């Protein structure tokens, strides 16, 4: 339930902020944070390779347990749910009966004080992780490994989920957040339920500065530039595109497909996405 | 506490001891949700009126039980988890209604 503001400034008219009402702990576990080297979208040559990045708030990275098969069989208690500035989801702090403390992505409806567990035998229960082959068909799942033991790769953004649709030998058929239908190996891990903080998409940044807080520097339209800069540059007065709408680098950007055709994962993509 | 009849159909093409593991799960689920078994009518394999899971038959369980009303929905759901549980219909126990 996003929070709104009275129009006491021009920007507060529209600004919405997350309600943060699920967060129980407001500074991070000191043994599970590390420095996040800001990049400004510059590579190791020093060149901007992703335009319009930088200048955002300082952040500590929280180390997230994307494996969970690390600790098959060891129940953990949900100790706290916390803010994480490096992702859209919230994160949950597990106190394993081992003594080990780890973070995971906070699925929807997970509660402080409940217990979660990973493994083939885990109860079909929000927060438990299992290999996909043991999750019954139809179950809504998240934090999905894309290849066995390579780490949860799919459905990790706030609100997303993947639905199990069928099985076929060693493989399961998933419907991804995009709506694509894909084979994923049965031994791949996933966590029961959807990612939480589903209201994330309804936030209205409200003012330019709020984008700047996130590290997003202003985006300049190609039509605002000059011919040396961009296909859409130049012209007297305003100007329509005057050619198929293009990127700065000249490739077409309205419909031109860019997935590599001869890609091996094609044998596993059943249906391309939707909408 | 209220009395209910819990009807269950299972995968008919199992062996007898796999069938027993399923019933053991049923039994624990019943026990964990506060159920009080009174009867047990296990007619087992019965050919159906139509295919269920491409199967013309299924293994029929039945339990006259007593449990706290606020839990039968979760129980009936927890029973539905196992894939071999192809049908579960909990029903309020009713006094008979008779003709002739």
């Amino acid at each position: 339930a996003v929070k709104k503001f009275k129009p006491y400034t021009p920007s507060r008219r529209f600004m919405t902020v997350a309600d943060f009402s699920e967060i129980t702990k407001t500074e991070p576990e000191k043994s599970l944070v590390k420095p996040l080297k800001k990049t400004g979208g510059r590579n190791n040559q020093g060149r901007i390779t992703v335009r319009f990045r930088g200048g955002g708030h300082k952040r500590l990275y929280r180390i997230i347990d994307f494996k969970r098969w690390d600790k098959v069989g060891i129940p953990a208690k949900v100790a706290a749910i916390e803010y994480d500035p490096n992702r859209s989801a919230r994160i949950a702090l597990l106190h394993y009966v081992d003594g080990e403390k780890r973070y995971i992505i906070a699925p929807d409806g997970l509660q402080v004080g409940q217990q979660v567990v990973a493994g083939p035998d885990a109860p079909i229960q929000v927060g438990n992780a299992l290999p996909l082959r043991f999750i019954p068909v139809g179950t809504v799942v998240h934090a999905v490994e894309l290849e066995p033991k390579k780490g949860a790769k799919l459905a990790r953004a706030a609100g997303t989920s993947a639905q199990i649709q069928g099985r076929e030998g060693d493989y399961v058929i998933l419907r991804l957040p995009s709506g694509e239908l894909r084979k994923v190996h049965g031994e791949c891990y996933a966590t029961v339920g959807a990612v939480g903080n589903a209201d994330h998409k309804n936030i209205v940044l409200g003012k330019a500065g709020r984008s700047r807080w996130l590290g997003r520097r202003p985006h300049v339209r190609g039509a605002a530039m000059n011919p040396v800069d961009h296909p859409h540059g130049g012209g007297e007065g305003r100007a329509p595109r005057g050619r198929p709408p293009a990127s700065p680098w000249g490739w077409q950007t309205k419909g031109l497909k860019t997935r590599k055709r001869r890609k091996p994962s094609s044998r596993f993509i059943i249906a391309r996405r939707k909408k | 506490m209220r009395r209910y009849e819990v009807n269950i159909v299972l995968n008919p093409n199992l062996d007898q001891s796999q069938l027993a593991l399923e019933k053991e799960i049923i039994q624990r689920a019943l026990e964990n949700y506060g159920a009080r078994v009174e009867k047990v009518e296990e007619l087992g394999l019965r050919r159906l009126a139509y295919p269920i899971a491409k199967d013309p038959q299924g293994y029929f369980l039945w339990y006259q039980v007593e449990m706290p009303e606020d839990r039968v929905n979760d129980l009936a759901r927890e029973l539905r988890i196992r894939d071999n549980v192809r049908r579960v219909m909990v029903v309020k126990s009713q006094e008979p209604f008779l003709a002739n």
Binding site: - | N7, V9, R46, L48, A49, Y50, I52, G58, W62, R87, M89, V91, Q94, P96, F97, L98, A99, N100
Partner: protein, 68 residues
């Protein structure tokens, strides 16, 4: 010919009584009218509710084909 007459005492809430109940279906699986059933207003509602359960349990059909 009426079903209620051609049947002794029976419980029309027992939904597992396929032998009694399957006599209340047409050749094509439809719940018989009262003009065939011989049941009253109160009895027919109870019969239908229990036939409907048994169809879900797989004990009765939703629909059969017509053979000539």
């Amino acid at each position: 010919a009426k079903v209620k007459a051609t049947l002794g005492e029976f419980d029309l809430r027992d939904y597992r009584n396929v032998e009694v109940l399957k006599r209340f279906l047409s050749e094509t699986g439809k719940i018989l009218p009262r003009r065939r059933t011989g049941l009253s207003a109160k009895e027919q509602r109870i019969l239908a509710k229990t036939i409907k359960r048994a169809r879900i349990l797989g004990l009765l059909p939703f629909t059969e084909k017509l053979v000539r």
